[PDB]
Amino acid sequence: KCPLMVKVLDAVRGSPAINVAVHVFRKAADDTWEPFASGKTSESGELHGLTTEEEFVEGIYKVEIDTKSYWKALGISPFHEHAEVVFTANDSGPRRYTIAALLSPYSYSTTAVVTNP
Amino acid sequence: KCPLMVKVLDAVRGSPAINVAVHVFRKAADDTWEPFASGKTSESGELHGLTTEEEFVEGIYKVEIDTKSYWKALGISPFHEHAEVVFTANDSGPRRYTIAALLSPYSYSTTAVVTN
Amino acid sequence: KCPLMVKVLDAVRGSPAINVAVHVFRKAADDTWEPFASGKTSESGELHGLTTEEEFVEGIYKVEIDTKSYWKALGISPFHEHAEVVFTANDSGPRRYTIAALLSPYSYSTTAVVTNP
Amino acid sequence: KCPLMVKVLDAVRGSPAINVAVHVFRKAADDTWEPFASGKTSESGELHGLTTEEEFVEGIYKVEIDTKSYWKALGISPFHEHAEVVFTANDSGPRRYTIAALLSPYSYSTTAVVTN
């Protein structure tokens, strides 16, 4: 909940994007993506509880949002396979990260809100 | 064609937004919006030929894009009455402005590309 | 708080946009913009308490965010005079509206989240 | 130049994002990313000539834009390592794709324009 949150919105319906799968990976020493955490957005479009302050160490993380399944379920054939962000976390000490994504069938926009606990 | 261009994209269909009405206004000394230029986007989502260098002086301009009519034509319920973009232009003299807009039914994004 | 909320984020700093002025207008019978409510975003980038369920009737509303003052205070000369959205509210009965804006010096993006109470 | 174009804009400076590195990969049968094409954006923020119709077959493609290096060159601390854009292309045969990206230090937006 605390250190990594994901929020997903639907720009076609003006709503949270509900029950969207989110997969988080962390780059290992051998430069491969290791599975780190995953979950589904709630009825508010939010995903909390992915990790903890102890587990969320320095690293390069990928957050991969399964936008394709979301659109397909609504009868839309979308462009992207997913929406993903890749970022270095906690380089200058622990921070809280909110990754927000705004979804359309042929477009997405993502931002990060980073705060110091 | 040169000093002020508008380009509109459709984020739902992954295409230019074609036949979108665009009106441009300039702020008058009494803070009312005076009609300045208008047009409809082409098949490429672009609208050129709005003004000339001589006519486009420093001032506050409003570009109003009729997004509601566009979505209604597609049978999609939209949130906004329109998308407008208000900016100060040609202080520091003439400049070249492209106002781009990316449209979704319940969201839009606009950016300005100001080049040479 | 309930029926109309505004949230503003800074895409340059990855932060809420704090202490941003927001002015709300409602179109009168004579097609003029009448002042409806105003406020400032908090340290979380949020503005609650603008109106109430009784006051927020059907109408065409404008939300005008003073982005120019925000950027100027940070030493940036931005493009826009403001970021504004214009929308019809409560056409099909009362709804809750969240207007979110994401700000950059030469760009902004706005979305609406509309829910049924 | 024809089937796959990339265009990158800078939302902070209101300009094309120039000299941005772009790498394109195609997903291999073993789910690894195989190098496909690359280049740097021009003075107009555009990158043409990546592939040809014959080479650009249906598959899953990744366009990876090195946004971090771009912001570092400007002395601005960025959030993302890069901006990547993953999509399935030429099922239903060849198509024309423009991948556009709008960059800020802590945000980006991408849209696809798929025309005739």
Ligand SMILES: COc1cc(/C=C/C(=O)/C=C(O)/C=C/c2ccc(O)c(OC)c2)ccc1O
């Ligand atoms: C219109 O522009 C966009 C808006 C959004 C919405 C993002 C969103 O809801 C963000 C959030 O809900 C996160 C907000 C936030 C604000 C201040 C804080 O100090 C904080 O950490 C404690 C968190 C997402 C994508 C967009 O393109």
Ligand SMILES: COc1cc(/C=C/C(=O)O)ccc1O
């Ligand atoms: C990808 O996000 C965006 C793209 C554009 C398109 C600009 C152009 O085609 O020149 C405009 C606004 C956006 O938010």
Ligand SMILES: COc1cc(/C=C\C(=O)O)ccc1O
């Ligand atoms: C939605 O706005 C329009 C779009 C088009 C182009 C293609 C189409 O028919 O969708 C033509 C006229 C329109 O008014």
Ligand SMILES: COc1cc(/C=C\C(=O)O)ccc1O
């Ligand atoms: C930030 O990336 C670049 C931008 C430019 C163009 C103009 C400038 O100097 O800012 C040139 C080389 C770069 O690597």
Ligand code: NA
């Ligand atoms: Na460090």
Ligand code: NA
């Ligand atoms: Na009604």
